[PDB]
C-alpha cells in the first residue's frame, strides 16, 4: 500500500517501459490479457504497488506513456505485452520534437503537459498512500529531455513531500548517434539537479560493454539493453513488494545514500549475469555475488570508480541466504579497499535482504553506488558543449524558438558548480573542523 506511479518519456522511455512492465508482469505472474495464473500466494499480497484492479479480476499498470511523435505508440501498443496498458494512458502529440530541446520545453512540449498532468493527477489521487513517482527517459533527444524535465518541474511543484526517482540515459562520447546531443545534455542537468530525489545514470556504451564482455552475445540489440535496464529497475523496489529479513524501500535508500541535496547521481549494476559457456563452471554463492558486483565491468554507467572515491554504497540481495555472510563480505571489502572509500563517513555500505528471488533463479543482488567518479561525465558533456558554443554551431534552432543566449551560459555555470562541489567533497580532510563552529564555546 505504498504506490509507485510510472512515467515513460520518449522512444527510449517507452521501450524501456514496455520491457520493464513485461519483466514485472512475468515476475508477478500476469498474462498479457491481465489476469493472474501463478503458483504462490505471496504474489497477490503486494500487487497494488504497481497494478490497478479492474473488473473481473484484471490488473492494469499504473503507468503513463508520453510522446511527441505518434509512431512510437503504435509499436508500443502492438509490442509483446501491449494489451495490458490502458488506452487512455497513451498521451501522444502529432508533430515530433526533432531532437530539439527548445521544441520539447517551450514550443511543442508546453501544449502537451496540460494534457499529461490531468492523467498524472488522476492516477496519483486514486492511490491509497503514494510512495512516489518514477520516470524513464533519455537526455539525448527532444521528447525525453525537454518535456521530461518540464514534467519533473511541474510534478515537483505540485507534490513536494513525495519521492522522485529518475532513470536517465545520459549520452555517450563514443556511441553518440546524434550531432546535437551536447546542447540537450547540458540544458537538462540543471533541471535534474534541484528537482529530483534520486537519479540513476544509465549509459549505452556501458550496456554494450556488459553485453560484449560479461555476456558475450552475438547481436546485443536494444531488447537486450532494455532487458538489463529493467533488471536494474526491478531490484531497487523489490523490497516494497516482497517480504524479507531486512527491508529497505526508496526512502530508506535515499536517506542513507544522499548526504547533501545536490549529490543524488548514482551508478547501477546487477549481479548474476553469466555467459552461456561459463555457466556450468560457476557456483551461485553470496561471496561470489559480492565479489562480482563491485567489478568495474559490471557498472551500467561509463564512469570508472577507480578514478574517484565511493561516497556511499547500497546493496539489495534477493534469495534464501544468511545474514552473517552478507555482513562479513561488506565489512571485508571496506577493510581491503582502504583508499577507494571516503574517510568522513564510516561504514559507507548499506545492506538489504529480500526472501523471494527472480523467477527461475536461486539468488541475486543489485548494487547502487554514489561515487565521486561521476564528475567526469559532466566534464565531458561540458567540454563538448563549450566546444560547440564557442563557435555558436547549431544555435539558430534553439534561439529562434524562444531562447535567449544567457540560458546556455547559466547551464554551463551550474554544471561547473556541480563538478567543483564534487571535487571539493572528494579532496576533503576528515580529521579537521573549522571556520563555522562556535569558537569552542563555554569553559
Amino acid at each position: 500500500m505504498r504506490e509507485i506511479v510510472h512515467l515513460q518519456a520518449g522512444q527510449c522511455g517507452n521501450q524501456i517501459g514496455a520491457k520493464f512492465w513485461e519483466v514485472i508482469s512475468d515476475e508477478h505472474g500476469i498474462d498479457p490479457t491481465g489476469t493472474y495464473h501463478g503458483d504462490s500466494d505471496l504474489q497477490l499480497e503486494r500487487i497494488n504497488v504497481y497494478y490497478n484492479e479492474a473488473t473481473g479480476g484484471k490488473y492494469v499498470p499504473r503507468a503513463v506513456l508520453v510522446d511527441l511523435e505518434p509512431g512510437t505508440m503504435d509499436s508500443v501498443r502492438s509490442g509483446p505485452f501491449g494489451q495490458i496498458f490502458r488506452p487512455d494512458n497513451f498521451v501522444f502529440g502529432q508533430s515530433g520534437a526533432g531532437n530539439n530541446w527548445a521544441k520539447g520545453h517551450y514550443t511543442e512540449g508546453a501544449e502537451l503537459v496540460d494534457s499529461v498532468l490531468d492523467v498524472v493527477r488522476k492516477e496519483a489521487e486514486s492511490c491509497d498512500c503514494l510512495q512516489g513517482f518514477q520516470l524513464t527517459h533519455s537526455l539525448g533527444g527532444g521528447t525525453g529531455s525537454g518535456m521530461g524535465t518540464l514534467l519533473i518541474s511541474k510534478i515537483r511543484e505540485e507534490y513536494p513531500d513525495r519521492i522522485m526517482n529518475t532513470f536517465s540515459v545520459v549520452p555517450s562520447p563514443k556511441v553518440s548517434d546524434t550531432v546535437v546531443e551536447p546542447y540537450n545534455a547540458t540544458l537538462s542537468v540543471h533541471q535534474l539537479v534541484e528537482n529530483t530525489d534520486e537519479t540513476y545514470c544509465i549509459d549505452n556504451e556501458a550496456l554494450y560493454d556488459i553485453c560484449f564482455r560479461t555476456l558475450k552475445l552475438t547481436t546485443p540489440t536494444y531488447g537486450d539493453l532494455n532487458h538489463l535496464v529493467s533488471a536494474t529497475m526491478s531490484g531497487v523496489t523489490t523490497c516494497l513488494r516482497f517480504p524479507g529479513q531486512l527491508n529497505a524501500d526508496l526512502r530508506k535508500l535515499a536517506v542513507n545514500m544522499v548526504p547533501f541535496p545536490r549529490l543524488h547521481f548514482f551508478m547501477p549494476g546487477f549481479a548474476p549475469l553469466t555467459s552461456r559457456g561459463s555457466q556450468q563452471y560457476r557456483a551461485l554463492t553470496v561471496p561470489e555475488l559480492t565479489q562480482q558486483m563491485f567489478d568495474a565491468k559490471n557498472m551500467m554507467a561509463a564512469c570508472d570508480p577507480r578514478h574517484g572515491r565511493y561516497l556511499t554504497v547500497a546493496a539489495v540481495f534477493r534469495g534464501r541466504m544468511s545474514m552473517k555472510e552478507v555482513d562479513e563480505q561488506m565489512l571485508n571489502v571496506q577493510n581491503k579497499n582502504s583508499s577507494y572509500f571516503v574517510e568522513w563517513i564510516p561504514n559507507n555500505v548499506k545492506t538489504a535482504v529480500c526472501d523471494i528471488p527472480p523467477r527461475g533463479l536461486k539468488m541475486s543482488a543489485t548494487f547502487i553506488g554514489n561515487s565521486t567518479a561521476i564528475q567526469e561525465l559532466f566534464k565531458r558533456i561540458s567540454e563538448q558543449f563549450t566546444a560547440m558554443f564557442r563557435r555558436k554551431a547549431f544555435l539558430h534552432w534553439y534561439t529562434g524558438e524562444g531562447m535567449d543566449e544567457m540560458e546556455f551560459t547559466e547551464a554551463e555555470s551550474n554544471m561547473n558548480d556541480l563538478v567543483s562541489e564534487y571535487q571539493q567533497y572528494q579532496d576533503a580532510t576528515a580529521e579537521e573542523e573549522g571556520e563555522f563552529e562556535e569558537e569552542a564555546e563555554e569553559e
Binding site: 505518434p70 503504435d74 501498443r77 501522444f92
Partner: peptide
C-alpha cells in the same frame, strides 16, 4: 490505426480489438 485521432479517421481496426 492506433495513432490517428478519433476525428479524421476512417473505418480501421484498432490493435488487439
Amino acid at each position: 490505426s492506433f495513432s490517428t485521432p478519433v476525428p479524421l479517421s476512417l473505418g480501421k481496426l484498432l490493435p488487439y480489438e
